Amino acid sequence: SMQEEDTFRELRIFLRNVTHRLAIDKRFRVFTKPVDPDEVPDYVTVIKQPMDLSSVISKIDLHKYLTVKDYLRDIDLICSNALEYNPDRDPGDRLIRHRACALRDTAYAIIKEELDEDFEQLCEEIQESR
Ligand SMILES: C=C/C=N/C(=O)CNC(C)=O
Numbered sequence: 001s002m003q004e005e006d007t008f009r010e011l012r013i014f015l016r017n018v019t020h021r022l023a024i025d026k027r028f029r030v031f032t033k034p035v036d037p038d039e040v041p042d043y044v045t046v047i048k049q050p051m052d053l054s055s056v057i058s059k060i061d062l063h064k065y066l067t068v069k070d071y072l073r074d075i076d077l078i079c080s081n082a083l084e085y086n087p088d089r090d091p092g093d094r095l096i097r098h099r100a101c102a103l104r105d106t107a108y109a110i111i112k113e114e115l116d117e118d119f120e121q122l123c124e125e126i127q128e129s130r
């Protein structure tokens with residue numbers, strides 16, 4: 001229905017706004033763009049599902065997210081990819097992991113404060129209906 005399409009458009013608006021706020025945070029710069037294979041040629045072979053905030057924005061616009069839950073799965077992927085690819089005790093790796101965990105915690109906390117739980121429940125019920 002058109003009311004359903006208004007619901008998902010509000011969802012996309014909300015997700016673009018949250019994603020923009022993460023993308024402009026200097027700590028998260030490394031997660032704003034896909035890894036360059038010309039820097040890291042083994043990335044694409046170690047990490048099977050690369051994910052970054054630029055790709056998240058593209059997916060919102062392609063209507064790939066019908067719930068905040070499916071958006072958060074991609075935030076989680078950004079974070080777990082960074083933990084998996086950079087697992088060493090040295091400071092370069094520790095810094096990336098700290099930032100990856102901060103990216104995830106920040107996204108969850110914005111959503112906890114600003115997403116209405118009845119709005120998410122509606123999205124889930126429309127999605128489940130399709
Ligand atoms: C699980 C996410 C991040 N963890 C860290 O690397 C924390 N490192 C320190 C000592 O600041």
Ligand SMILES: [Cl-]
Pocket residue numbers: none
């Ligand atoms: Cl830096």
